[PDB]
Design a protein around this ligand. Structure first.
Ligand SMILES: *[C@@H]1O[C@H](CO)[C@@H](O)[C@H](O)[C@H]1NC(C)=O
Length: 235
């Protein structure tokens, strides 16, 4: 994906136009660049089987790849290497940066990608072949689970709808908190960007089932959490 970052392409433009003259004879420049560009364009391109894990990467990981690649390309720019050794080390550095990228993508999937164990997440991915930003939808069963909440009388009742991955998810609209009646109907008791609901000075009338549903601009509901609230005596 590094080809998708303006800093990499500008870096290669300066490398070809300015820095190559220092290291190598002019007449071998173009061919060298061809190879360089070829290798830089092969970054992240998928061979099927497992390789699909390199076809797309989040903006942050693309940033890491960009900056390590630029670090090495600058190292070689500043090296005393020339001729055959400069070419050998250049191609080796491209192969090594390709390894670094592969590691960053593999890692990105293991941890960063589809971290949600429930609900629907939306992550901005860069597809490396065409350099296209798309919204990747990690879709799992919308209902995340049921919380058993117990609160003494005249205390604060807090319903926490926040999930780990929520902060990272894209396109989140407001959380909506509903009260689910024994009659099998519900009324919205709150809506807004706050991940939680607070009800003050609860009483037995507040005992019951509650529900939290997070909404998105496009994809749908991101998360649902149900709450079973039992009001205890004051002491
Ligand atoms: C049940 O439903 C009715 C209308 O369907 C609603 O007005 C009422 O407040 C609800 N209350 C209980 C205790 O079920």
């Amino acid at each position: 994906c590094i080809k998708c970052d303006q800093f990499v392409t500008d870096a290669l433009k300066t490398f070809e136009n300015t820095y190559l003259n220092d290291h190598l004879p002019h007449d071998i420049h173009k061919n060298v660049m061809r190879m360089v560009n070829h290798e830089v364009s092969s970054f992240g391109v998928v061979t099927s089987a497992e390789d699909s894990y390199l076809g797309a990467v989040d903006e942050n990981t693309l940033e890491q790849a960009t900056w390590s690649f630029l670090k090495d390309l600058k190292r070689i720019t500043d090296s005393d290497l020339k001729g055959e050794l400069f070419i050998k080390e250049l191609l080796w550095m491209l192969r090594h940066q390709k390894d670094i990228f592969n590691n960053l993508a593999r890692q990105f999937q293991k941890e960063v990608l589809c971290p949600n164990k429930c609900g629907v997440m939306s992550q901005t991915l860069i597809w490396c072949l065409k350099c296209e930003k798309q919204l990747h939808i990690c879709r799992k069963s919308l209902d995340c689970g049921e919380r058993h909440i117990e609160v003494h009388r005249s205390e604060d009742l807090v319903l926490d709808c926040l999930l780990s991955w929520h902060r990272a998810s894209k396109g989140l609209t407001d959380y909506s908190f509903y009260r689910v009646w024994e009659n099998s109907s519900e009324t919205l008791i709150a809506k807004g960007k706050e991940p939680y609901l607070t009800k003050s000075m609860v009483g037995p009338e507040d005992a019951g089932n509650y529900r939290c549903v997070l909404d998105t601009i496009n994809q749908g509901h991101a998360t649902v959490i149900r709450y079973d609230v039992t009001v205890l005596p004051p002491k």
